[PDB]
Design a binder for these strands. Structure first.
Lengths: 49, 205, 117, 109, 101
RNA sequence: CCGAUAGUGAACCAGUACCGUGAGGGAAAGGUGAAAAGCACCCCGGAAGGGGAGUGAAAGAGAUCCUGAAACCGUGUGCCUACAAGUAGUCAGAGCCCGUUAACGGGUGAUGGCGUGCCUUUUGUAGAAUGAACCGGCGAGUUACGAUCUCGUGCAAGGUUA
RNA sequence: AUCCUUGGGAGUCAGACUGCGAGUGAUAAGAUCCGUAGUCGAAAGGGAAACAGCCCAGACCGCCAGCUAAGGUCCCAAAGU
RNA sequence: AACAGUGGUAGGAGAGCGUUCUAAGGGCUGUGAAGCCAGACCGGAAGGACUGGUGGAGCGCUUAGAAGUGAGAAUGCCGGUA
């Protein structure tokens, strides 16, 4: 591997979902959490079981 | 690998015979790639720190009241919404080292050495005898062995003769016998070895 | 690494304002009202790219009756005449144009009346 | 053609656009007489700039100073002082002490 | 003057009048005859049973190029929808010679 | 890691100024030039403030003193306007005026057809429901450590070593 | 051309209106509460003068192409005094 | 290449564009870098490029990697100006 041409493997790297930037990305305004619902607010969330 | 030996001047008749299991592997193109990247990482120091919202030395009383003036709610002075700061998440100092398995870790250096044999770039420098320790000796040898750029020198002894030279030579790096590693070989394009270190490296691994 | 992003905002502000010249008042001057008004004038665009395609026909149909009644026929009857005597697939801007060089249109209207009997 | 610049004498701009709009287009024998009698007491700020603009054209270029047409006369709001003036019931409003830049470009007929 | 279905949409054409129609390859530089002529005109050799049997019109294709860039931008006036389509349109600068009756 | 709304609150005579009886809160404020060569002399002006003259590469660099945007405030203007009802645009459109990152050119567009902002929250908002005076900058989904699934890599009833 | 399992991954668990069938109501309500179907919501276009729910119909994009649906065919305003 | 599709909130998946820094060399700068303003140029968009003028010392490209990675709405914060 010449350090110029340093390309990764076939499908081992993948971009993080940058959540909450702009409308047209998907998941911009509500940032995937949803609407009015315990779960959409900050700080969780409820106990697991 | 039946590469002809070098007299460091001659240079020279007589060829050496290397291990197929070390210098004759089809190089793994994506197992090498993982190993540069853990090598570049953790050379970074990780000393980036941000005074967080609590951690900012700041008065915590509310500036004005809750409800009753023509303003907003505006809880603390030193928050995230204010001029004073600071960053919400921020970078905190942290780690970057992590160890690959040795069945990878061998097969990285087993790959890149085997790759550079095919690309006609190993020049085995027998016995590396230097009669003084000035850098002008290594000026002539590298140019006399017709190499120009960044270069590695594998000394099986960690010589005071070799290593005091050639470091002021701005591209060439003098390496420990054990001290071979992937960001030295990939970076410096070419590596010069004693006859004794090929005995050593093929019986390191 | 700290990311100011001090330039990227500016060049987007200065392409919408490029697309907002000639607007009345200070919609052309400001940004934060202009980005509404460009946003209208794209949504106002696409509707009106389907009006000239649908309302220029509502010109030339009047510009047939303003010639078809010179020869004593109606568009509701004339476009039946061209559909029978002839299977004529004449463009309705161009059975219009047939007015620019009248009486080429009337001789087509002459072709209409023969199968109106 | 000549130019004089005032650069930060304390007056409001809008209290000096009005003195100015009996000048732009007039003559030297038709503005120094008019500025003395407006009375509009931002006048002798400008009249010490027009008359200084003519005696620029007197010394520096010798453009036959009595035969000049006043061409450009724009005035811009310069560096604004700002003071807080107190007010009852704890209001403490603001007073904007404005400053202007008078430029009277005097030119040949 | 000749009336031609190439399109599919119809053009009034005299000889020499530069006419923009669809992208048709024509290997821009070559010559193409047009094949659906209605209404010869002039001496009013008028159409009948559509398409004047073989009254074709030759044309020297000169340029094949794209139009002004047009920004298709539809947006829903609430609900966070934005669809911004840059768009081009391919013409062919057909130069027309020898209206043949 | 930061490059002056960041990084300590403080790159600057900062816990200063101010605010509080008092415990306490607590700022803003970087850059002439390579060096002062920091503008001798003449003209206007009481004096600041200018115009010539020299200084230097620059003086538009001359005291917030490199860069200087926008809101704003001007001055000139080329085209439109004093029978007009308008979320101010779009598509059509002659006249008039210019010649271009050479293109089915650019600007104003007399008038006609269509057309009630953006966002939140809602069953439903042009909304007479909330939000914003504008302009510029800062401002919000990670990070540490584990558990799970796909994807990839090495080795394969043997894999990793703290 | 869909469905079954299996795993990862979320949103909604307040809906409205119109017709058909029901209760409460006074066989009152753009009323409430169910079934069923549509549409809206998440749907732009044309109708219904303007109109989230009726009527017709689904917007990848350009055309100064043609044919039709609901509704129309004196002027407004396209099409038959 | 044939045939079909291509409205869309909450949401799931995929592909991209940006900005800052580091790593390979390769490549522009006093014969003028970054940034600024103008303009009728090009790609599906995010967006790029070119000529002019200002600006007077730094800067991009490719290929990967890290992330204080993107602004119109917080009665947000500060400053300026209405």
């Amino acid at each position: 591997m010449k350090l110029h041409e340093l390309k990764p493997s076939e499908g081992s790297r993948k971009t993080r979902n940058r959540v909450g930037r702009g409308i047209g990305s998907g998941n911009g305004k509500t940032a995937g959490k949803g609407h009015k619902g315990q779960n959409a607010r900050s700080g969780g969330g409820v106990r697991p079981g | 690998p039946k590469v002809a030996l070098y007299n460091q001047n001659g240079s020279t008749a007589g060829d050496i015979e290397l291990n197929a299991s070390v210098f004759g592997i089809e190089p793994n193109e994506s197992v090498v790639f993982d190993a540069i990247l853990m090598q570049r990482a953790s050379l970074r120091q990780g000393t980036h720190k941000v005074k967080n919202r609590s951690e900012v030395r700041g008065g915590g009383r509310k500036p004005w009241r809750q409800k009753g003036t023509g303003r907003a709610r505006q809880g603390s002075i030193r928050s995230p919404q204010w001029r004073g700061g600071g960053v919400v998440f921020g970078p905190t100092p942290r780690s970057y080292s992590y160890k690959l398995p040795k069945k990878v870790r061998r097969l990285a250096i087993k790959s890149v050495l085997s790759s550079k044999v095919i690309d006609n770039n190993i020049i085995v420098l027998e016995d590396l005898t230097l009669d003084t320790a000035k850098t002008k000796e290594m000026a002539a040898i590298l140019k006399g062995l017709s190499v120009e750029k960044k270069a590695l020198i594998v000394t099986a002894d960690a010589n005071e003769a070799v290593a005091l030279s050639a470091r002021n030579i701005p591209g060439v790096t003098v390496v420990e016998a054990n001290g071979i590693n992937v960001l030295d070989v990939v970076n410096h394009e070419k590596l010069l070895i004693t006859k004794a270190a090929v005995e050593k490296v093929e019986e390191v691994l | 690494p700290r990311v100011k992003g001090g330039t990227v905002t500016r060049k987007r502000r200065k392409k919408v304002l490029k697309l907002a010249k000639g607007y009345f008042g200070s919609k052309h001057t400001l940004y934060k009202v202009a980005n509404q008004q460009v946003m209208k004038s794209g949504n106002y665009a696409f509707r009106d790219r389907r009006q000239k395609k649908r309302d220029f026909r509502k010109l030339w149909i009047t510009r047939i009756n303003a010639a078809a009644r010179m020869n004593g026929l109606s568009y509701s009857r004339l476009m039946h005449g061209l559909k029978l005597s002839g299977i004529e697939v004449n463009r309705k801007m161009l059975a219009d144009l047939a007015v620019n060089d009248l009486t080429a249109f009337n001789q087509l209207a002459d072709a209409a009346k023969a199968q109106l009997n | 053609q000549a130019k004089a610049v005032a650069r930060t004498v304390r007056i409001a701009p809008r209290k000096a656009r009005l003195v100015m709009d009996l000048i732009r287009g007039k003559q030297v024998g038709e503005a120094v007489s008019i500025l003395n009698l407006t009375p509009r007491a931002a006048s002798p700020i400008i009249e010490k700039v027009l008359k200084s603009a003519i005696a620029n054209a007197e010394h520096n270029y010798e453009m036959d100073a009595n035969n000049l047409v006043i061409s450009q006369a724009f005035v811009d709001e310069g560096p604004t002082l700002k003071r807080f003036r107190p007010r009852a019931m704890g209001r403490a409003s603001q007073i904007n002490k404005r400053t202007s830049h008078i430029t009277i470009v005097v030119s040949e007929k | 003057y000749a009336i031609i279905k190439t399109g599919g949409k119809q053009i009034k054409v005299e000889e020499g009048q530069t006419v923009y129609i669809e992208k048709l390859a024509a290997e821009a530089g070559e010559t193409v005859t047009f094949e659906d002529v209605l209404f010869v005109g002039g001496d009013n050799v008028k159409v009948g049973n559509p398409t004047v049997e073989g009254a074709t019109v030759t044309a020297k294709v000169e340029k094949q190029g794209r139009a002004k860039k047009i920004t298709v931008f539809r947006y829903k006036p609430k609900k966070n929808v934005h669809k911004k389509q840059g768009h081009r349109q391919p013409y062919t600068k057909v130069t027309i010679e020898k209206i043949n009756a």
